[PDB]
Design a protein around this ligand. Structure first.
Ligand SMILES: [Zn+2]
Lengths: 192, 421, 157, 419, 192, 157
């Protein structure tokens, strides 16, 4: 992009913790000029969210806005505006370039879809089912991908932290494993 | 005729009586005030009559209610006759009863109720026809649009002052005639005279001679000229926040005739530096030089590009090329081809053209020679800064132009109360 | 050694169109069952329609259905979600279709002047939508979408 | 020299740095902020120096503090030398320590403390001289008097608006050159359903120009509805200045002694007949229909001050003959009008009346005054369609400021007087 | 007076009830254009006092003002300004013209002085002594003058209503006798 | 018929001056005792100095010491209170005397171009005041008061 700036329009009623974690991760790779703004649409955005971050390579402009789906506008003269905090999360993480085979990459993308739709906006029924698939997966591998940390882990953890079911043993170890990492704790503290 | 007392052309109001009478505003005629005997002084907007009944639209400052003169227990036939015979725009004192309507009156602002008339006196008799050239403008300013535009424009001026005054500013009175020029000189003299923060609402002048109203700011800062720029920005933000909170009635009244999406802005006002803007225009396919000034069409485009990305009708363009700005513009200490200047745009049209002023007499004189000015005729201005001149910046906005671009109107004349053809 | 079982009761139109474009690259078979399952290995299966589409486009290297960079790669992910939600429902369709029209104003294909999963997943869901077919008959369908839909109907049939 | 870092002529502020620095205002340097390391940007009012020590009077907007550059644990000899060598009115950034004084500093506003200097940088070097031209007026407006007068005048304008706006008024912008008077435009606004209007802008009456705050208000049945409003607005201005701007009043009082401005809450109203009785009792041969001569206005004010003890009163029901044509005649006594003047310290500030909203009567009175109807056709035509009953009045911002502080010449309250 | 107006400057900290009673009495004799004002000196005058009165012959302009002694300015071009609520009370009552002999007139004036100085600003000692002289006097005569109601009665009653000591029998009958009159009750109710 | 007993320890100066001006009108005698008492009848006595002054001026009809109307009558009542309080004390005397000066600016006598109780009661108290006699010696006494005091000292011997 000639704009060189990642614009992200997000609704403050449902803060995209998935993107705030990935932002901290992005800054640990590149020189990021991060800025927070409040759109005319929303009034009286919570204090914590306004200063949630506290030349350069990339711009990261987070605009708190009254939108139905979290939107990213990057290099509009070459790229259609991206909708869905899941789709934006994949893009941000993919900037580090941890290339995976076809089976893993698809399974990682599958894990994002689960977290965003089924787990987040689901009954105690579906939540319980998601925990089993995670518990079984985390029983075999250290992460949900197992090679190393992936977007799948970031987004899913972020969704779990932003919602009354019994939590299994492997998920508890994976939760502290995530929370132990610098980008996860920094982002979560500035939300709480 | 038994209602002969209840109507007529009442004697010219030369302040004869102080009646125990409460003339309730039309906006206050809601469902809450139903089945009450109220007095109303309004104009007759339109008066349709058929046989036994006469309906009037009683209007008052962009608000109107449906009034009804029915023959029966209240009025006579000659009263209904007189009611329809009242010429258009005549002002009338009306003693009526607010009665709840079975279905909404979509035409009127007071949809919840109608006014069952008991008395009607013409206090001011309008002559029959209506013109379509001073008396022209008088009628034109009664239109719900004009009323809403200029009541909102009054709002801008109030929000402008209340904002600056609360942040510790002092209003000055620039003379504006000298034996007619621009007011910047006087603001800068005030800065040089220990008046830290000054503003002036007054008429400004630009193959024609043009007069318009300008709201001007001049502020002494500590170390960076952004201290002023970020203040001017917040002040324009506070104006927008103010209009969208209080003047929502007036915005919609203009919207109804001139459709326009709500004005959009960011709380920390968006700032693009000149280099960033050129990259956006060149990516958008515009052959432009590094030191060239933004052509009026490019300003229009750049605004659209900003709206496309950030979705804000209000942004700041900073670090302009020094060559294109006036002499008194402080050069950038690092890149001496760039300046510490800025423009602010509403819907992609320039409203403000501010910068840091040169408070050093010598550098101010050098830049005056660079622009080829006879120092003799600006000796007085330069001499002002020789004794304790603090660092300061400023910027001015066209009240009419701001009102126009906020409501998204086309021609400036729409937001000028008394335009001179 | 690839096998796909499809819900015969409601065929995944976009998946089949994808399968037809990867026949050249990797050997894949079509069975008919009660639900959509892509059998890759004894351990590797996918239930979600988008998961199936994503795998096929990735494994079909020469096809290039997942774009030519991370930017086009992401654009496609957007359109998969777009098709799966906003087109899958006919709620406020008048708005949805006008967004897709705007996006196709200066685009021939949805992503990168070549056939992508975006083109397939959207066209498939759009064909399967009722309100779309009504807009076409009543001739109130936007210009750019109609021309794009007509162009894909030609290449896909 | 070891303090060469701590002083000097710092580079011209071209917005190079954004320093983590808090330049505290001089007024905030009180006993509460004692034994604190503070930064101050002020001007050098006067700098007296004797051997080892150099004392400065650091001034900022009609406030000043005593600063001290002492050789020892803090400063060097060349720094004290440089401190006294700083030319008058030069602006300086000062890093000092607020220390409590053993005895009050009666000369300064900050009597409770002095500033023990640690650094002094001249950010703006004033040239040595001070003139006594344009640059003349720049220095003159730094005088604690001027500062106080014009900061208070800004107050009047704010209190004028805040008052009227809260009462449901709408500010208009009269076109100042086409160059004549603004009443016409206010009346057209009234005739255009703008019930309550005011305009702060330059007015004219050799050509003289001054700033006028004008009111025009449509009333129900009596013109007193407007008069009693205009009065309350002037009362609210006075109440406002005496509450908030007490610092600015005393600063002008210190140079120009004047008793506090006195007024009554329901503003005193005398009718013209009552005023003649007071003047005749005071021994003044005057006619029933004559206009109050400027000296009689001065006297009558003193007589009102003697009786009621108010510097602000209203003279009502003026003789019709002496007022302009557009003045509505009294319905009972057609020799009298529905006009009024308002006086501050016995000098006229306001000259208002009820306007003639009937086109015919307005034309009759225009012929009585011998006006060519042709050249005022436009004005008369404004009232032909739904003209409501209305009155108004205007005040001279400079004149109000002058008579409130009890100053002699108007030039004192005019910021940029034109010789 | 060519002014035709009785101006009375009074302190709202100590409302002169004596003058408010006499005002009601004055209106019952003459056509009085009564008006209440608040001087710049005093701020936030109690609500009741502002509207304490709910061509013409006399003006009665009551100005609430920060003065030490209640002052009356009447026909300044012929009469020195009068100081003392006692002295003003004598003048107001004397407008009705109930002429008395030298002995009574002096005894009436003596009764005013007692009320204003000794009774108002006095200890429980002097108050008790005043009651005896009143009790003894009211024992012989219906009022303090005894012939008819006098300024002496108005001022003294007013002082007693605006201050502990045992009250005798005659004073209680004289108090209700006063309170029963129209001008006394009307004035006292609007003070509260 | 009339008798006055005076405090010999502190004579009521103004009362005596009044008594000297009513000798022509009504027969009055002077005894010397321990307090000020005007014995009019067996039932009628007056302790207060002002009460005594008031009675004498009222009963002495031809003297006319209580003015020529209710207005002058009231002016005198003011000056009796003025003398009894503001002059009787030397507290803020600098203010008190300047008020009396202003009042005597265009007046020859205090009330109605003739000798009144005002003239006597004020002059008496003013003579008896310490700070007054100090102002005269130091020549800081106001103009109009001095001229008035000098004129009464001449008439009163
Ligand atoms: Zn304001």
């Amino acid at each position: 992009g000639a704009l060189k700036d990642i614009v992200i329009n997000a609704n403050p009623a449902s803060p995209p913790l998935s993107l705030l974690v990935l932002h901290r991760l992005l800054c640990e790779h590149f020189r990021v000029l991060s800025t927070v703004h409040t759109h005319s649409s929303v009034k009286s955005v919570p204090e914590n969210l306004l200063k949630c971050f506290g030349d350069y390579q990339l711009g990261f402009t987070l605009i708190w806005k009254n939108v139905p789906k979290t939107q990213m506008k990057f290099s509009i003269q070459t790229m259609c505006p991206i909708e869905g905090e899941g789709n934006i999360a994949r893009f941000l993480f993919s900037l580090f370039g941890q290339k995976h085979n076809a089976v893993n990459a698809t399974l990682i993308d599958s894990w994002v879809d689960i977290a965003i739709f089924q787990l987040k906006e689901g009954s105690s029924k579906e939540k319980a089912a998601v925990f089993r698939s995670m518990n079984s997966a985390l029983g075999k591998s250290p992460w949900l991908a197992g090679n190393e940390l992936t977007v799948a882990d970031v987004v899913l953890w972020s969704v779990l932290q932003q919602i009354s079911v019994t939590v299994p043993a492997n998920v508890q170890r994976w939760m502290r494993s995530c929370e132990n990492l610098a980008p996860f704790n920094t982002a979560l503290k500035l939300l709480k | 005729d038994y209602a002969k007392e209840r109507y007529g052309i009442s004697s010219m109001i030369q302040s004869q009586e102080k009646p125990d009478r409460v003339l309730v505003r039309v906006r206050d005629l809601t469902i809450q005030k139903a089945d009450e005997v109220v007095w109303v002084r309004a104009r007759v907007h339109t008066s349709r009559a058929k046989g036994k009944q006469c309906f009037l639209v009683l209007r008052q400052q962009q608000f109107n209610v449906q009034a009804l003169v029915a023959v029966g227990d209240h009025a006579s036939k000659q009263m209904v006759k007189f009611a329809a015979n009242i010429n258009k725009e005549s002002i009338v004192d009306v003693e009526g009863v607010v009665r709840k309507v079975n279905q909404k009156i979509g035409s009127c602002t007071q949809q919840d109720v109608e006014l069952h008339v008991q008395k009607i006196y013409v206090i001011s008799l309008a002559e029959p026809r209506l013109p379509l050239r001073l008396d022209n403008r008088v009628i034109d300013l009664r239109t719900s649009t004009s009323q809403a535009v200029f009541r909102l424009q009054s709002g801008i001026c109030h929000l402008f002052r209340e904002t600056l005054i609360n942040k510790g500013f002092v209003e000055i009175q620039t003379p504006k005639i000298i034996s007619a020029q621009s007011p910047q000189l006087y603001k800068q003299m005030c800065i040089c005279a220990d008046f830290e923060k000054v503003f002036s609402i007054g008429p400004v002048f630009r193959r024609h001679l043009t007069e318009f109203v300008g709201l001007d700011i001049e502020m002494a800062f500590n170390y960076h000229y952004h201290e002023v720029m970020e203040e001017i920005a917040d002040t324009m933000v506070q104006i927008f926040k103010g209009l969208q909170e209080r003047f929502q009635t007036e915005i919609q009244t203009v919207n109804k005739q001139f459709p326009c999406e709500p004005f959009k802005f960011l709380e920390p006002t968006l700032r693009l530096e000149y280099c960033e803007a050129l990259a956006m225009l060149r990516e958008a396919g515009v052959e432009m030089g590094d030191e060239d000034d933004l052509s009026t069409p490019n300003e229009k485009l750049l605004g659209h590009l900003v709206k496309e990305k950030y979705d804000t009708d209000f942004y700041i363009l900073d670090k302009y090329p020094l060559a294109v700005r006036p002499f008194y513009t402080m050069p950038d200490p690092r890149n001496p081809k760039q300046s510490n200047s800025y423009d602010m745009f509403m819907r992609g049209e320039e409203i403000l053209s501010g910068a840091q002023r040169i408070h050093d007499p010598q550098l101010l004189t050098e830049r005056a020679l660079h622009h080829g000015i006879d120092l003799e005729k600006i000796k007085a201005y330069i001499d002002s800064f020789r004794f304790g001149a603090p660092p300061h910046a400023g910027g001015g906005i066209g009240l009419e132009r701001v009102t126009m671009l906020f409501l998204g109107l086309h021609n400036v004349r729409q937001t000028s109360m008394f335009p001179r053809d | 050694t690839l096998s796909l079982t499809v819900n015969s009761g409601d065929p995944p139109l976009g998946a089949l169109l994808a399968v037809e474009h990867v026949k050249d690259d990797v050997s894949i078979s079509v069975e008919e069952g009660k639900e959509n399952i892509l059998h890759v290995s004894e351990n590797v299966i996918f239930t979600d329609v988008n998961s199936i589409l994503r795998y096929l486009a990735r494994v079909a290297t020469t096809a290039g259905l997942y774009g030519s960079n991370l930017m086009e790669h992401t654009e496609i992910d957007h359109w998969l979600e777009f098709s799966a939600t906003k087109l899958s429902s006919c709620d406020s369709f008048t708005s949805t279709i006008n967004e897709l029209n705007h996006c196709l104003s200066l685009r021939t294909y949805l992503v990168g002047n070549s056939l992508s999963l975006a083109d397939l997943c959207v066209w498939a869901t759009l064909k399967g939508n009722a309100a779309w077919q009504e807009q076409l008959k009543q001739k109130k369908a936007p210009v750019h979408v109609k021309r794009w839909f007509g162009f894909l109907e030609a290449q896909l049939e």
